[PDB]
């Protein structure tokens, strides 16, 4: 249970390398028990650890005119809305009510749709520049059924409801009850982060239990990895270990050793040590 034993197991499992064992123990302590730790090859000469708190997806802003903080090259929204849509967008006519309603309040709004065409981008950017309503647009992350699954996950965590055309829900009739909330949102060129959502907890436990039980029936370890990553993203944290070596051969050797140490530490936590 203690971090000393985990560090010792990781050290022994990596050909007596104390640095990787200590790094793995620290990462496991930071992330916790319900989380994902993965290893990717780095670019520097020494290993580094990067941990992500909350959830984030690899989707960025559509247009460079949304950034209100050019110093960091990223846009920050304070207490915004979240609008979830699965249909392609090419005309603004379906969002006049929601945009006018949220402009009547003042605090910002965020749009998560699978794709928005330039016709709506024009009105959105001109409205943001003229200082009437502050909005941002990000593409829906992923593809296929996984995309809708993670859209539902975002809806559950942010305390809102998804808007799907196939379930007979239209965006014209949407109102503030169908929009979620979040403490802060940070969007850069490649990632979008939702910070401290206001969803109900029991829904969170229900969703994580559903995905956890769905893990069992999966036959490919790739699907198991994806669903475990989804569980960690919805609840918990995700950490990545970037191993560093001068040459590609040493890179592969160190990566294999670190993966072996990770597996050994996981098994020791699960069952115990002798």
């Amino acid at each position: 249970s203690d971090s000393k034993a985990i560090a010792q197991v990781g050290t022994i499992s990596a050909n007596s390398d104390e640095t990787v064992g200590k790094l793995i123990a620290e990462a496991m302590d930071k992330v916790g028990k319900e989380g994902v730790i993965t290893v990717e090859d780095g670019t520097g000469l020494q290993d580094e650890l990067d941990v992500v708190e909350g959830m984030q997806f690899d989707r960025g802003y559509l247009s460079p005119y949304f950034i209100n903080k050019p110093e960091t090259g990223a846009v920050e929204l304070e207490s915004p809305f979240i609008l979830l849509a699965d249909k392609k967008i090419s005309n603004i006519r379906e969002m006049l009510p929601v945009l006018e309603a949220v402009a009547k309040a003042g605090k910002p709004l965020l749009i998560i749709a699978e794709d928005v065409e330039g016709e709506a981008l024009a009105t959105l950017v001109v409205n943001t520049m003229r200082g009437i309503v502050k909005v941002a647009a990000v593409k829906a992350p992923g593809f296929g059924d996984r995309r809708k699954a993670m859209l539902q996950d975002i809806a559950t965590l942010t305390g809102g409801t998804v808007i799907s055309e196939e379930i007979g829900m239209e965006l014209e009739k949407a109102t503030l009850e169908d929009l979620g909330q979040a403490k802060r949102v940070v969007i850069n060129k490649d990632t979008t982060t939702i910070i401290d959502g206001v969803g109900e907890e029991a829904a969170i436990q229900g969703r994580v239990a559903q995905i956890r039980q769905q893990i069992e029936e999966a036959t490919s370890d790739y699907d198991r990895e994806k669903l475990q990553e989804r569980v960690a993203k919805l609840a918990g944290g995700v950490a990545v270990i970037k191993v560093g070596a001068a040459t590609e051969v040493e890179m592969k050797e160190k990566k294999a050793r670190v993966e072996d140490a990770l597996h050994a530490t996981r098994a020791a936590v699960e069952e115990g040590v002798v």
């Binding site: 690899d58 593809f143 296929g144 996984r146 036959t219 490919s220 370890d221």
Partner: protein
């Protein structure tokens, strides 16, 4: 046993050359019902060459056809080193033949003789619904899926160049699963490597291959070296007729090696193979056999076929003498007789140029309307 079939996309120079040759053939056939066409195409970096012997009473300019055809694949940019409009096409075709009046006289079209000597083969198995070997069929479907997605615009950074390899294992002569799936495709530089394989496997690999045939032992390979940005005619020499084995069956059936693209229906090197597949598909759809092949032989300057042989691999429900008897008295194997009953003299060879000449229901030679009659006769 472990067998692998490989298919290529329409953006490859050889497939580009094949498409050009068949596009000209359809245009010539549309203008001239009874033209003679024997053409070949060569494509390189910025230079396109066409040649052969085409004897027809009509005239067609090849420039507008080539630009229209190349634009169809999607070569409308100079980023890959080949653009439709910026390129140049030259003609090296002899539009006239000395023998246009000496041999104009004909005795009887129904007794026309074969212009070539050789033996042709057919093949058909009930492993797939399309009556075709599975590994080649699914390899064609994968690259077909990639083009449809690329044309749909949902995946705009994909490039025409793509290659797929599918591996199938057989236990007691039956399919039991999928071993390894490889899809090699060219992409734009904006998207990183990690996001690249995720899109292709979940939208091309996933909704095409059967789910019940995929197990935990299946291995998915995407971009083995890691960077397939370089492609197009710049990276490889282009010429016509080099992968006939890929187009016909993928190696599961013995083939005569005769080139298909750029040839008129008059030559038996193309049409007679179509009839053999038509006969083989018909004789197997009736349930008379699990697999069957038709061996038809022709001699240059000889009208009547020398020999017709049928082989079944011992799966026949009736003696082979009955099988040979039925095909002779129910199928017209005449070199001109099969032309009339398969009505190939129509501008339909453009779509056949890519994605395999066989394995599509809409093709005239892939119909199974005669299967019911043979079942009654042999029953």
């Amino acid at each position: 046993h472990l067998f692998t079939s490989e298919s290529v996309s329409e953006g490859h120079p050889d497939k580009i050359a094949d498409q050009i040759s068949d596009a000209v053939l359809d245009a010539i056939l549309e203008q001239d019902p009874k033209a003679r066409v024997a053409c070949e195409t060569y494509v390189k970096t910025g230079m396109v060459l066409v040649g052969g012997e085409i004897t027809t009473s009509a005239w067609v300019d090849i420039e507008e056809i080539t630009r229209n055809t190349v634009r169809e694949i999607g070569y409308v940019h100079s980023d890959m080193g080949f653009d439709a409009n910026s390129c140049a096409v030259l003609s090296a075709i002899g539009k006239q033949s000395p023998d246009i009046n000496q041999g104009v006289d004909r005795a009887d079209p129904l007794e026309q003789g074969a212009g070539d000597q050789g033996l042709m083969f057919g093949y058909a198995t009930n492993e797939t619904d399309v009556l075709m070997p599975a590994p080649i069929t699914y390899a064609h479907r994968l690259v077909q899926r990639q083009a449809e997605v690329r044309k749909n615009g949902t995946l705009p950074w994909l490039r025409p160049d793509a290659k797929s390899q599918v591996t199938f294992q057989y236990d007691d002569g039956k399919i039991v699963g999928i071993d390894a799936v490889v899809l090699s495709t060219q992409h734009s530089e904006e998207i990183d490597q990690k996001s690249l394989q995720e899109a292709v496997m979940e939208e091309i690999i996933k909704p095409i291959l059967p789910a019940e045939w995929l197990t935990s032992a299946t291995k998915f390979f995407i971009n083995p070296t890691g960077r397939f940005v370089i492609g197009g005619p710049m990276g490889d020499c282009g010429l016509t007729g080099r992968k006939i084995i890929v187009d016909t069956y993928g190696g599961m059936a013995r083939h005569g090696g005769g080139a298909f693209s750029g040839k008129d229906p008059s030559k038996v090197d193309r049409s007679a193979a179509y009839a053999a597949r038509y006969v083989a598909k018909n004789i197997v759809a009736a349930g008379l056999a699990d697999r069957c092949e038709i061996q038809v032989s022709y001699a240059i300057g000889v009208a009547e076929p020398t020999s017709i042989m049928v082989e079944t691999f011992g799966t026949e429900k009736v003696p082979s003498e009955q099988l040979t008897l039925l095909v002779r008295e129910f199928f017209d194997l005449r070199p001109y007789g099969l032309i009339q009953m398969l009505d190939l003299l129509h501008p339909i060879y453009k779509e056949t140029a890519a994605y395999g000449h066989f394995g599509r229901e809409h093709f005239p030679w892939e119909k199974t309307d005669k299967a019911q009659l043979l079942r009654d006769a042999a029953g």
